[PDB]
């Protein structure tokens, strides 16, 4: 009686709770951040296959009403896109202390010809008056063990991050024209492609796929 009816009440209430949370789960699955990211990555591949929508040194604001904006004006704290896109990219993928480990794709110019390269972020300096191009101090760590010897290296280097190009530029520390450039997918930020390029010939002679460790 006064317990059977109460129990039936509690039961119906539990079932309602279940149906409600089910709706919530549909909502969550639809807006799942990871899914949206993957979508962005796919869209990005397509964009890579298409003709550039903007002049060589500009930035596509995107949206249903496209617009091109100078690369030097992205993430400077002043809205230049009509949709403010230039001022919402502004999350630096690199934080002081981050490690990225890159595995070799091809390579025919690096000194040690290593299997993997660890890029360690040591510090970040952001000029308040020029926030669109943060400066990083990073170390390029390599460990190659051949027959004749075992070599370990940790090359301190200076870098710049471009929010405009979603791109890390690591200036060479040794006496070769060899710089590291990490291109970000635009949406991932846990993985970039690290191409090694001769600062001069612009020749692309090595590539590593870096992942956030």
């Amino acid at each position: 009686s006064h317990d059977e009816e109460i129990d039936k009440l509690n039961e119906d209430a539990l079932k309602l709770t279940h149906e409600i949370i089910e709706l919530q789960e549909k909502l969550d699955r639809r807006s799942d951040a990871k899914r949206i990211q993957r979508a962005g990555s796919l869209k990005a591949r397509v964009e890579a296959l298409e003709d550039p929508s903007c002049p060589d040194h500009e930035h596509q604001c995107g949206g249903d009403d496209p617009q091109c904006v100078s690369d030097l004006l992205v993430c400077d704290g002043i809205k230049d896109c009509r949709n403010g896109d230039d001022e919402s990219h502004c999350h630096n993928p690199f934080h002081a202390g981050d490690d990225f480990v890159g595995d070799v794709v091809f390579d025919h110019c690096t000194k040690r010809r290593p299997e993997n390269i660890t890029l360690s972020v040591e510090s970040i300096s952001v000029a308040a008056f020029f926030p669109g191009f943060p400066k990083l101090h990073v170390h390029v760590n390599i460990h190659k063990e051949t027959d004749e010897d075992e070599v370990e290296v940790s090359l301190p280097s200076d870098a710049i991050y471009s929010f405009a190009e979603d791109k890390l530029i690591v200036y060479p520390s040794e006496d070769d024209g060899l710089g590291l450039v990490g291109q970000f997918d635009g949406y991932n930020f846990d993985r970039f492609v690290g191409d090694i390029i001769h600062e001069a010939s612009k020749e692309h002679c090595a590539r590593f796929i870096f992942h956030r460790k």
Partner: protein, 142 residues
């Protein structure tokens, strides 16, 4: 470093790479300006005549371009000391009477030295640029 014959040549070549292609030139100019005004926002009052309150206004665009043109004459004549002295005297006259603290010139320098490597993105020398800018700025001040 100091403004050698050689490092002047280096600065001259790099300035060619940065300025000579009138595409993003007004944007280059305006970037320099946003940086400057970000450092020393009190300096905007000196530019009332030319709409310093809105760096996207056509009047201020015209301004920043006039500036970069003057600076271009200065850089272009680093290897022609007579002409350089002439242009520097001219700029000095255009600037005398205006109460401009060294402060503001340091702001300008810092702005230029941050926008430049963003423009070139590659092979550039901040020490040479520092030296030669110092020479030009000293010329404009007196």
């Amino acid at each position: 470093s100091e403004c050698d014959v050689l490092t002047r040549l280096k600065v001259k070549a790099q300035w060619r790479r940065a300025y000579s292609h009138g595409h993003n030139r007004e944007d280059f100019a305006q970037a320099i300006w946003r940086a400057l005004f970000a450092q020393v926002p009190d300096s905007r009052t000196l530019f009332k005549r030319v709409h310093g309150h809105d760096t996207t206004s056509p009047e201020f665009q015209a301004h920043a371009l006039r500036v970069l043109a003057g600076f271009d004459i200065a850089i272009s004549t680093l290897d022609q000391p007579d002409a350089l002295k002439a242009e520097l005297d001219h700029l000095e006259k255009q600037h005398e009477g205006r109460h401009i603290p060294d402060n503001y010139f340091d702001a300008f320098k810092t702005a230029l030295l941050h926008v430049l490597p963003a423009q070139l993105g590659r092979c550039w020398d901040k020490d040479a640029w520092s030296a030669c800018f110092d020479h030009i700025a000293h010329g404009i001040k007196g």
